[PDB]
Symmetry: C5
């Protein structure tokens, strides 16, 4: 055939380690354009982001060079990567033990050595999450690419000439805002410098799950605690009501802890509000016990009325402070 | 022997990278028919679907050709895939890090190059699930196959001529309705175009587990809350009963949060009903507190009777709104 | 040496793809008998069965043939499978992504071509569980083996001449009853026919863990629920005691749903009894509420006495209905 | 160099399948001594033991034979296992799907063919646990090694001549008692026999975690239940206190069931004590209900005093029955 | 080209097993410098530490040598590890089944044989954690490297000449203090001796999650317990309040046990304080029961006043003893 002849005549002595350059001092302008097609998940327990995407490689090759006119056209040939040279561009903060690939076993070539190896992969990266806004958070994550082994003296990791990648991959759990990728000059040491590509993915949470699971039960428990001071001390249910709120707040705290991650910086607003209704319960149990001991003149009516007013105004201001996020 | 000499004569210089076509401009008509023999699971926590099945490959081969009359019949020979050409048809939204195979190490051949590579695999795909009807939902799943590396200019990914695949794989947990596969012409970019095969599996949930675990306790707590307004204010148990319902609703909310997935769009109907009975408990506890403070003329009888009637009508209408699904 | 000489002389041109037969129309009589030496687990959550065992392969080989008389005896030679032909017999409903092996890297040979390859493996299969009797169930499991690629026209998958495998692998968690293997002729399509070997493992549950965790607390909660009607209505404890039973039943339902699997058909007996004690606490709370509102002539004594009699007889008859299983 | 000359001159025709013996009837005396350097864990949920260690191989080799006198000394050469013959000695109850290795890629050799391959591995084995004494248990586990493929007619799996391996690997979670390895002749069938090596590791639980998490709360709730009969029937708190104990024992039962394994033989002592205190709560709630029923002559004082005495003596005798273990 | 001919001329007969030394008695001075760039996690459940980093390997190579002057410069060439010699330096207490690598498939070489292999890896090691100060702890962990197969007679595992690695890679969950690495001479046996490089990472916990989820609810439950002696015995709520505290403490214990690791030595301070609050509730319920029995002259007022004083001083002193950690 003809493709077999081309493979025989252009993979004669092509070692998979030799740098595909003519002049040793010259480098190869390896391009890159990473695209995320679907974000899988963002687990804050281990600060892992799992996003499905494809990485667009493109580099010139001095050794791969053939003319189509004598070889009957055939301007598109597909070569597996195991037989041609390959850049070592990998994601720096990969979560997986090994950097895995999907259909990264075949790369197209052109007559002017213009390979377009495009692996697809489930990138598992690390990003910092600011849970101060949690769950109404906008934790932007970063995907980073580059070569750990060789540096700018070997390859010039550059961005694609056409960077029309202003896409919005809207999902059912997150809304994704793509950020135009940039190039930064990494410095392994003082003498030598490396190259790197940064891309940004801004995640805005649009799922109702966390609101329904935390905000509604917590605010409604705060609602019952707001009505705590009304029960008369002699009813023998005031302290029982308070301890019931203790149990309910403890259950909500256990659930939130089961959900909210261990590796945390500042406390989330929902966790703070749950803690704050918990101390609400503590303080108004203090006042209920004081009132019942004093009952056995009865001026406790003014006391718990002003107490109710103070808790109304302070709880509503903390609630609006929390709501200002959304 | 005969098979050994046939292998020697037909694998002389068959590289595993060369496209098996005579004319370079011509393509190879690769067929496909995916069949699901047993669905394993559908985990909505990560929107993953695990289904066991086999995928049927069929393509003509120009190079592999022999006459059986001189070679003593032998119309069926079994060749491992590592020695012959192979299409890169893969599932687009694979959940696994790598696209794994089961007994995809041997493919049959015919004298007119008519290979029948039939891998078996545990396909792990992604689905979009409308949790509104959950658990009485019909979350359809799609399995999509195609070639990421090479495109229509290389292969024509086409459906089987005989598509009698109207089967129903009825399981003990899901009712599976097969959908006749379709072919869609994927467009990687404006200049180049690709091919793809999409199949559908409609999943009907027939498991008693979910409604037993959620609907029964939730409607039961709704029943108990419905009876709350009879408890006299002076009995010192109405508030205790209400806080007991608070604790029960909190426990049901914890179970729902543990089971119902985080990656959620609209709220499920069972979650809505649970939140609705939870705010029910809030409101009728408010009325109980107002009644007990007003007790210490006693018109609360008419008040809680009309209250009970209003909650009868609204609880029955929300319950029948839920039941309209089933 | 002599073993190296034999290997050089009898593995001259032995490709690992050629069918080891003299006449092409003739097939090779591959024997098989799977033996389970220790069952690991049976997880009903994903219908997975993990059993450790060994699979006995035995097939004649036309090509491998030498006389020991001129080769100084030596009737026992060990060959790794990577260099000899191997049947593709695999388990049809494997749960693992790939069909893995243990010490399946060496197979013995005889002078009259009687290879006795015996892999050991952790078989991970699928079972259908009739959990109506759960936990006092007898969920039988089936292990099925055969060749997906090649069929009866290639190999005759048969049982061993002697099938004395009537063993009982009694464990500390399961009673294992082996079933003699059977051969069934699988039909991939109308024109072609395949072969398969099925074996059965009857699993009796002898563990006390599930009993102690579910039946004892459930029946004792039902016991307390039975005593609820004796509490006088005016004691302000009947409603509190009833809601305490409601919370206890809710917690027990949480733990049961945590343990009992999602992929379910008919409801298990313990789950039915738990739902039934939920109904119990609901109904007797209804009657207690009616009694307390009616208290404010007091004929409720006859009412709750006949109520206790009716509920005692129905609870004991349902309890003996459950006990009839064990 | 010189080591390259050794490698060229001793790996001339070294096949990795030939048995390293001169006379075919003779066997090779393969020695072994497994050593555990750090036990990772013992999970009773799946009866798995994860222990880090190294396994010591030692066998004579006929083909490796060279004298240092003409070869400039060099008594120490390191050979990777891929080019040298190795025995198939593998753990008989391996828990992993495949038998994994750590730095089992290089083995030393001597001039008198005395290969000393010493792999390191995380052995994941199966052992039987007597949960009766749990947590104050001494569940000894066994590691068993041998050759599944070939038998005593091929290798004589023997123990090290110097077996001074009476070490104590004391950890922060388990007390490890080493047991001298023994050799047994495994019988695959009646005609042929195999070989095997047993080592024993006795695990004494010295952790305080299980005591603090189960014994303390269970005995403490038992302490509260012991004081239940003092509460007067008319105080309207005896029944509420009893149901609070019901909820407490239910919570401890849930957490214990979450921790205690499913694959269980006889009931653990802590589980038995928890069941005992739970039926304690049932019985004394029965007596409280009867006392309040007769409350509405009051001879109940003698009744609950003698009840307190009898249940105190039986509580303390069961407690000392538990304490006899520790 | 030039790199291709250099590779042909310098990988003529370079086996990947021969020690790269001229004199057999001489050793090769393999250097090492480990760097941790980002700690992932420290899971005390299995005493595992996951830290992302890179390992700096550097060794002389006698065979690998060229003169750049006649080879047109080219002072740095990139070579994959599969074709050159490699040290077997690995982490001694690796948690993973196999020692995995990231981009450890390419190593640079210099003209004076100064290979500078720099693998990157997710080190999963074992370290001892002193849970006494937990969560306000400083549990140091150790990473250790060395050669299990060959010893000092083969390689002199030395530390980097420039050890300016005094970096503080502070994260959002742990404050990381690097410790300058040291060299220790491991002794496999009496006759032979090995080498090893040890480095230390001091991990200070700065996360707010742990104290927020444990100490705050625990200290506030102790606070609520402290108010208990005020409730009058005749109010029929003191026993109910106490049993509510018992249930809350039981829930808190269940949550802590879910979080606190099983592999434990000394009890953590938070767990001890929780045990103290159980003792709190038990003792004050005992006194409450005694007071209510004695109520039916009333000198109990002095009793619970002095009880409050004694328990307040004991709780405040244990609280300040706990706070002395932070
Ligand atoms: C790499 O490309 C950038 C793009 O502007 C250029 O500034 C830089 O000089 C290039 N470096 C090399 C070594 O080619
Ligand atoms: C592929 O097959 C479809 C089936 O009708 C046909 O319409 C299309 O033209 C074919 N394309 C090529 C490139 O053969
Ligand atoms: C396979 O063996 C069975 C055993 O009786 C026999 O009935 C059948 O004819 C055999 N088939 C072939 C193709 O040898
Ligand atoms: C193996 O060694 C044991 C050690 O005493 C010996 O009793 C036995 O006879 C040996 N067997 C063979 C086949 O060498
Ligand atoms: C290894 O290096 C250390 C560094 O001082 C030195 O003390 C020791 O003697 C060396 N050993 C060998 C065998 O070179």
């Amino acid at each position: 055939a003809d493709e077999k002849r081309l493979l025989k005549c252009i993979l004669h002595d092509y070692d998979t380690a030799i740098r595909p350059v003519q002049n040793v001092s010259d480098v190869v302008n390896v391009a890159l354009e990473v695209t995320v097609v679907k974000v899988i998940d963002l687990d804050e327990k281990e600060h892992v982001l799992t996003t499905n995407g494809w990485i667009y490689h493109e580099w010139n090759d001095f050794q791969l060079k053939w003319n189509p006119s004598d070889y009957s056209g055939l301007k598109k040939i597909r070569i597996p990567v195991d037989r041609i040279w390959t850049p070592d561009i990998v994601l720096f903060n990969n979560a997986d033990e090994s950097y895995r690939y999907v259909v990264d076993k075949l790369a197209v070539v052109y007559y002017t050595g213009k390979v377009m190896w495009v692996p697809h992969a489930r990138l598992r990266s690390f990003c910092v999450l600011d849970l101060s806004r949690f769950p109404f958070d906008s934790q932007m994550c970063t995907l980073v690419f580059g070569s750990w082994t060789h540096d700018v003296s070997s390859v010039n990791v550059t961005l694609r000439n056409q960077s029309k990648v202003q896409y919005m991959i809207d999902g059912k759990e997150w809304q994704v805002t793509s950020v135009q990728p940039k190039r930064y000059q990494w410095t392994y040491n003082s003498n030598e410098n490396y190259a790197g590509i940064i891309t940004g993915i801004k995640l805005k949470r649009t799922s109702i799950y966390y609101q329904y699971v935390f905000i509604m039960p917590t605010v409604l428990l705060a609602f019952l605690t707001l009505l705590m001071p009304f029960i008369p001390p002699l009813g023998k249910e005031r302290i029982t009501y308070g301890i019931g709120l203790v149990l309910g707040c403890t259950l909500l705290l256990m659930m939130l802890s089961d959900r909210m991650p261990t590796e945390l910086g500042n406390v989330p607003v929902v966790a703070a509000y749950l803690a704050y209704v918990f101390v609400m319960v503590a303080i108004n149990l203090l006042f209920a016990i004081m009132a019942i001991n004093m009952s056995m003149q009865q001026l406790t009516r003014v006391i718990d009325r002003l107490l109710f007013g103070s808790f109304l105004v302070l709880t509503v201001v903390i609630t609006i402070s929390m709501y200002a996020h959304y």
